[PDB]
Amino acid sequence: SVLTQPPSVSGAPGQRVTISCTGSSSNIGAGYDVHWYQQLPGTAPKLLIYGNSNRPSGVPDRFSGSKSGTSASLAITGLQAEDEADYYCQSYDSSLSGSVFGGGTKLTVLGQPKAAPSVTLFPPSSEELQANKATLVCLISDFYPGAVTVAWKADSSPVKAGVETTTPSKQSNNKYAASSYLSLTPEQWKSHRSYSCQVTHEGSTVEKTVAPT
Amino acid sequence: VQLVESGAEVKKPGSSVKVSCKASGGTFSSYAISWVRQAPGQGLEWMGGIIPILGIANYAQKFQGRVTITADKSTSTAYMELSSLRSEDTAVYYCARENGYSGYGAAANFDLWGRGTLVTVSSASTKGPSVFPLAPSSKSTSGGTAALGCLVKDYFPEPVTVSWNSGALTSGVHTFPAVLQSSGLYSLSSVVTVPSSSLGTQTYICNVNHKPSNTKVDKKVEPKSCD
Amino acid sequence: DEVRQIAPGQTGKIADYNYKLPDDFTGCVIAWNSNNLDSKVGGNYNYLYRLFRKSNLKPFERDISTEIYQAGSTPCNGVEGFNCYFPLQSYGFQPTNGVGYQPYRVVVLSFELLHAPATVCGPKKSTNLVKNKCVNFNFNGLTGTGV
């Protein structure tokens, strides 16, 4: 709204990384203090520094907060293994008559080497046909990273309806797995000759087909 | 002190919610509290802050007179009420604490935070789920291993927990996340690695647990006779 | 008459019982006629083939099973009796045949794409050599431009 935060920021593990908070002259350049919060994806945010002058207990000294007039700056020295979160700029806004947060910056590099994906295609069972629906499953496992596109074809035209993709999750062996569902009905399930999945992972395309009849 | 908040809650677009904020210990009846909301896709917004010792409401101008806050002095907790739910209500609330200080700035700060209430609202409410057992085909097996599992389709709401033989087997198991369907349903799957020499001696049963709906359906997997 | 059968997307007698062709087939097949060497007068029956199989087979798999295929519901214990026939059968190659039954030497060259660096691949081709003109060249140590 009134506060605009950078979407992200690039840095190196060992150099100085800084961020800037820019707003209006009635909320941060007005004279009010700012507060910086860390939004870890999975735990509730805590307090890092208030007023840019006092260090709260349990917070390391490596975080530095400064106020360059109408803009606020946060500086860090060294990228450790817990900065994979979001940084927000929060201050009291007189026009909004309340506290408004910033946009949020992402500090995360990809760092994902390649791997060889494997796909499994399973036709629906007999008991699923009487449920007045046809759920086509399409499971992909043992791939890295978890960014695989999913395409459906019926040997004559691509399918652009009912296509879904789930977010992959980490496995026990630091791998990723995902599944794809397609919502059809047994009316035209038996009419077509065959159904398949087409996926592409860094140019590696594999095709698996099944025969209902 | 520490503040613990309730778990996930599901409601309807046009109903009322009931979220509680309790504090373990003291210093809850002397300092002002507030509510902070985080939503995936946008920033964090602040609806209003309530003094518990005086019982005086203090909201923001961006929010209309629809929500209400009450605070309790005996058992030292606060209640959340929100009526006429809308499509963007699917987010998480936080129960914050306000600590004042002295200085030129004098900005509102949230030192202490709660756990969080993930309130998701949509259509396609809770109903009895259906399980579809799957068996590997003859052409799908080439080595000494086979893949089999159980499917949970048309279930509501999150979260759900599955087990294999009531936790007897846990090697090679994997759980898949849900996905937002167009009509408002969810779908997950769970497959396990089974050697091909154990497809006719012992059986595997899939257990589904749905605590909001209190349903537990036991399903049996059978190999296909044709292929 | 079976060279048309080496293709992805059909069912027959040889392409499903000896060597299945998958849909993701980037293969490169070569066949030709050499009937003057692999065939001889009097009947050349050295090469065999499989005609009967219990079910289908995964592509890129070799089947060397010599077990007698059973058609009936009773065991035969390896006899040439009823409801049992030997799946491997002889050829009918002859150098005096026509064109649709001659011995053809067919080979398939397929490629593999994995997470490995290139091992067997075409090197850089030898282009034409030009002289007495301002051209650009690089002989292993410098990108030099000149005549």
Distance of CA C26 to CAs B65, B130, C2, C108, Å? 67, 42, 20, 10
Query: What is the C-alpha to C-alpha distance for residues C24 and C37, in angstroms, rounded to an integer?
Result: 35
- Classify domain A8-108 by CATH number: 2.60.40.10
Query: What is the C-alpha to C-alpha distance for residues A110 and B135, in angstroms, rounded to an integer?
Result: 38
Distance of CA C112 to CAs A203, B73, C6, C7, C121, Å? 13, 73, 19, 18, 12
CATH homologous superfamily for the domain B2-121: Immunoglobulins (2.60.40.10)
Tell me how the structure was determined.
cryo-EM
Q: Measured between CA atoms, how close is C89 to chain B, in angstroms?
A: 26
Q: Measured between CA atoms, how close is A138 to chain C, in angstroms?
A: 17
Query: What is the C-alpha to C-alpha distance for residues C147 and C139, in angstroms, rounded to an integer?
Result: 14
**Under 8 Å between Cβ of A119 and A200:** no
Q: State the burial class of residue C61 (Cβ atoms within 10 Å of its Cβ: 0-12, 13-18, 19+).
A: exposed
**Under 8 Å between Cβ of A108 and A86:** no
- Domain spans of chain B? 2-121, 130-221
In degrees, rounded to 5, the angle at the alpha carbon of residue B189 between the alpha carbons of residues B142 and B143 is 10
**Under 8 Å between Cβ of B206 and B178:** no
Cβ–Cβ gap C24/A205 under 8 Å? yes
- Classify domain B130-221 by CATH number: 2.60.40.10
**Under 8 Å between Cβ of A130 and A147:** no
**What is the gyration radius of the CA atoms in chain B, in angstroms?**
24
Q: State the burial class of residue C4 (Cβ atoms within 10 Å of its Cβ: 0-12, 13-18, 19+).
A: exposed
For every residue of C54-115, DSSP letters joined together read: SS---SS------PPEE-SSS--SS-SSSSEE-SEEE--B-TTS-SSSS-EEEEEE-----S
State the fold for domain A118-210: Immunoglobulin-like (2.60.40)
The encoded tokens of residue A209 equal 């087909």
Which residues in chain B are closer than 8 Å to A29, comparing Cβ atoms?
none
**Under 8 Å between Cβ of A103 and A3:** yes
Chains touching C (3+ CB pairs < 8 Å): A, B
Residue whose structure tokens are 């009937």? C35
Q: Measured between CA atoms, how close is C23 to chain B, in angstroms?
A: 15
Query: What is the C-alpha to C-alpha distance for residues B63 and B47, in angstroms, rounded to an integer?
Result: 7
Q: What share of chain C is helix, strand, coil (3-state, %, to 5)?
A: 0, 20, 80
Query: What is the C-alpha to C-alpha distance for residues C116 and B117, in angstroms, rounded to an integer?
Result: 48
Q: Which of A116, A196, A209 sits opposite C114 (nearest CB)?
A: A116
Q: State the burial class of residue B7 (Cβ atoms within 10 Å of its Cβ: 0-12, 13-18, 19+).
A: exposed
Cβ–Cβ gap C56/B139 under 8 Å? yes
Q: Does A165 touch chain B (CB under 8 A)?
A: yes
Residue A195: count other Cβ atoms within 10 Å of its Cβ. Answer: 22
Cis before B223 (ω within 30): no
Which residues in chain B are closer than 8 Å to A141, comparing Cβ atoms?
174
* Dihedral angle of Cα B149, B150, B152, B157, to the nearest 10 degrees: -80
Question: Which chain C residue is nearest to residue A194, measuring alpha carbons?
Answer: C9
- The values of phi and psi at residue A176, to 5°, are -135, 150
- Domain spans of chain A? 8-108, 118-210
In degrees, rounded to 5, the angle at the alpha carbon of residue B147 between the alpha carbons of residues B141 and A144 is 105
Counting Cα atoms < 13 Å in the Cβ hemisphere of C32 gives: 4
**Under 8 Å between Cβ of B116 and B5:** yes
Cβ–Cβ gap A204/C24 under 8 Å? no
The encoded tokens of residue C146 equal 């000149």
First to last CA, chain A: 58
Residue whose structure tokens are 């300092």? B31
Q: How, if at all, do strands B56-59 and B68-72 pair?
A: unpaired
Which residues in chain A are closer than 8 Å to B44, comparing Cβ atoms?
39, 88, 90, 101
Q: Nearest to residue A178, comparing CAs of A153, A202, A205, A144?
A: A144
Query: What is the C-alpha to C-alpha distance for residues B32 and B45, in angstroms, rounded to an integer?
Result: 18
Chain B contacts to C (CB-CB under 8 A):
138-139, 142, 227
Cβ–Cβ gap C23/A207 under 8 Å? yes
